[PDB]
Write a protein that binds this ligand. Structure first.
Ligand SMILES: *Cc1c(COP(=O)(O)O)cnc(C)c1O
Ligand SMILES: [Ca+2]
Ligand SMILES: [Ca+2]
Ligand SMILES: [Ca+2]
Ligand SMILES: [Co+2]
Length: 142
């Protein structure tokens, strides 16, 4: 109904132990799109709270070279402030490139206020970069 996957899927867990922090675990991705001449990609995940007019919240995973099915298993802490109720946690998969700019692969986002009320733990459909700033889509059940 909205869950046709065209860019792969990403496994995530997000919890807010208290209102002042969220813990984000980036698991793994499956079925990513090739964005290199070798038919592979070099994926990493960029995390930030948007809007970030001062570019101060960005964190990222390691890059996994030469794969369309990366496993990261990395956890990140965001320390939150009252202003963050207006913000969204942005999650973007990017293809690292050596000789050109990195290429966008897929994205999604979660409202901070929604994360403060309910945790995330599951697989998610990767969206285009524009959609990704506004929505997340849990994968459909079989
Ligand atoms: C839309 C969708 C379904 C069924 O979803 P409903 O909300 O029950 O209509 C099943 N699989 C995929 C991949 C879908 O996007
Ligand atoms: Ca590339
Ligand atoms: Ca690459
Ligand atoms: Ca490129
Ligand atoms: Co659907």
């Amino acid at each position: 109904x909205m869950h046709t996957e065209r860019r792969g899927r990403l496994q995530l867990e997000i919890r807010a132990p208290t209102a002042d922090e969220i813990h984000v675990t980036v698991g793994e991705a499956r079925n990513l799109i090739p964005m290199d001449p070798n038919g592979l990609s070099d994926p990493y995940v960029k995390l930030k709270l948007i809007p970030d007019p001062r570019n101060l919240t960005k964190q990222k995973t390691r890059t996994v070279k030469a794969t369309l099915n990366p496993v990261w298993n990395e956890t990140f802490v965001f320390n939150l402030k009252p202003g963050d109720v207006e913000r969204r946690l942005s999650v973007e998969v990017w293809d690292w490139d050596r000789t050109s700019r990195n290429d966008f692969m897929g994205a999604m986002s979660f409202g901070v206020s929604e994360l403060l009320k309910a945790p995330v733990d599951g697989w998610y459909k990767l969206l285009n970069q524009e959609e990704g700033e506004y929505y997340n889509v849990p994968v459909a059940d079989a």
